[PDB]
């Protein structure tokens, strides 16, 4: 075996074709399935795995009540091969209420965060064993990507934040080798808030698109150099913005360097990627709630801040059905690197008061150079009939 390097060119994407679905909430009405939120997908050189933060309980269980809180002592990182639902035989890889994972070409790295809100710990687990640990530097909810990390020539990178969600915060980029922390860089450039980054290999470096909870409805961008640990940042130029809430496409605007200051407060985890001067991206169909999901290409949207010329729209989930977090992952092909994405399908409390629990299903799509049709692939569970 050898470490991954991702040195192949990006594939010629024309849109996205269906790849997988879990059906977790429909199976839960007659089966022992784990309660989860904040899922993600990552792949070793041979196959893909689904990850999720469990709530330490099955769905048809007295412990499923009040599962809405994001931080508790019982949360653990679940791991399965893609397509196998989270049943009682699932492996718990670490204690965590926030996490990130990746495979370096030899073994898995897991980054796991747990502890008190004002004194949390981050554990680095590599090849099955704890190798390093670090403590909250700003004493205010240490957190990471909720999605895969990226590794080149054995050096993995991860984005971590500490501090306020509605003001200035401390963001650092950690460089890791076989679980050992080897370097740390502080955030640099014009990005003013950085949460929940989605990252992809762009040899020789790494590129990340993130969430701005403070002032932008446009998404921040972070570029990371693996050879000299240098960092730079900016915003997605596109006039069609990716965050939620946001202004309608008739009145929205963006800036390549600064938060657009339009419906800036709050947000949702998402993704976008460059295709020459064009940008591919996904977002909720509704502008002020996490309903539906759509993807499209914006012409010159990576370099021209005034462009609103879209093409190749696809609906993934129609406007009447709930969505949630979404994120990119990369798969190596015979001659090029493909981009794929996943969508969290949240159900239950606080919006759906028919039940006491909160949980999610998932759906997965991959970039295609071929042709495709139309459809909608929602969660599909009937909360009016299944257990409360």
């Amino acid at each position, epitope marked *: 075996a050898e470490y991954r390097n991702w040195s192949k060119p990006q594939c010629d994407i024309t849109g996205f074709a269906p790849f997988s679905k879990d059906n977790s909430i429909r199976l839960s009405a007659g089966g022992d399935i784990w309660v989860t939120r904040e899922p993600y997908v990552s792949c070793d050189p041979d196959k893909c795995y689904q990850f999720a933060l469990g709530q330490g309980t099955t769905l048809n269980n007295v412990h499923s009540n009040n599962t809405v*809180r*994001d931080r508790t002592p019982y949360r653990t990182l679940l791991m399965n091969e893609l397509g196998v639902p989270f049943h009682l035989g699932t492996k718990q890889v670490c204690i965590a209420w926030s996490s990130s994972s990746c495979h370096d070409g030899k073994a898995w790295l897991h980054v796991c965060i747990t502890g008190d*809100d004002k004194n949390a710990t981050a554990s680095f687990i590599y090849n099955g064993r704890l190798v390093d640990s670090v403590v909250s530097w700003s004493k205010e*909810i240490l*957190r990471t990507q909720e999605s895969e990390c990226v590794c080149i020539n054995g050096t993995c990178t991860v984005v971590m934040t500490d501090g*306020s*969600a509605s003001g*200035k915060a401390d963001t650092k980029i950690l460089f890791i080798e076989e679980g050992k922390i080897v370097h740390t860089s502080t955030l640099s450039g014009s990005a003013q808030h950085v949460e929940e980054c989605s990252c992809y290999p762009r040899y020789p470096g790494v590129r990340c698109v993130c969430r701005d909870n403070w002032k932008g409805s446009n998404r921040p961008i972070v570029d990371i150099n693996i050879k000299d640990h240098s960092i730079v940042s900016s915003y997605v130029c596109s006039g069609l913005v990716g965050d939620t809430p946001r202004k309608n496409d008739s009145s929205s605007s963006s800036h390549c360097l600064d938060p657009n200051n339009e*419906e800036g407060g709050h947000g949702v985890k998402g993704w976008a990627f460059d295709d020459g001067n064009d940008v591919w991206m996904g977002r909720t169909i509704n502008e002020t709630s996490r309903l539906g999901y759509e993807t499209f290409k914006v012409i010159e949207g990576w370099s021209n801040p005034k462009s609103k010329l879209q093409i190749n729209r696809q609906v993934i989930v129609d406007r009447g059905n709930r969505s949630g977090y979404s994120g990119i992952f990369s798969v190596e092909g015979k001659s090029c690197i493909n981009r794929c994405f996943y969508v969290e399908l949240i159900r239950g409390r606080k919006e759906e008061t028919e039940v006491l629990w909160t949980s999610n299903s998932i759906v997965v799509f991959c970039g295609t150079s071929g042709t495709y049709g139309t459809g909608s692939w929602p969660d599909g569970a009937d909360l009016n009939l299944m257990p409360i």
Partner: antibody
Amino acid sequence: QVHLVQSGAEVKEPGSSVTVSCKASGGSFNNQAISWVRQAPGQGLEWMGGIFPISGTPTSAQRFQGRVTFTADESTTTVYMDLSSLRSDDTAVYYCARAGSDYFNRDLGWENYYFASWGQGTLVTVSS
Amino acid sequence: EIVMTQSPATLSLSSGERATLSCRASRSVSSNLAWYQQKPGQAPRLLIYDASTRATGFSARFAGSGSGTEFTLTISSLQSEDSAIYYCQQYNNWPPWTFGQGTKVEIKR
């Protein structure tokens, strides 16, 4: 009873800083957030910020984000608010209040952030 | 960010009659709306929360109404102690927690 008790009135010169404090009479600092709200003469109410007494996450309104800081102590069972770079315009009654909210979700934000109980209010005036 | 508009600006009515106040939000606040009463020379007091339920200090004569973007408060059989300023406030998920500019009530004796 639980009710909040505030520090006395103050006069401060421009460019100076002021400390105001708020204590629970019942010793019962549960994790419900303590918030600061001000009222300028003949003008409406204005939220400035707050903190959870046990979990310790502070928050501030954008207009005051460079100027104000919050801290708390369970032993004195008191919340302390510091306002810096004072000007004549800051002359107002400052009230501490107890919110219906006691947890913050990383993703979903806050819930029940309305003020159930209020302190006596402290008059702060900025003058030479 | 979210703007709260309250009307009328001033209201005056005689004792023994019904009075009504209204509040509007620049976006839908999904029932995350509260009302306060402030008597002259005193700290404000919570009157209603979640647009629908009244605090321990007030009786059946006070009622809340509305949802989404428009809300209403009604006082039944007005009395001498009702002469005060009233304010609406939203608390929809994220800061800042903006208040309305308030409505003043004075009694036409």
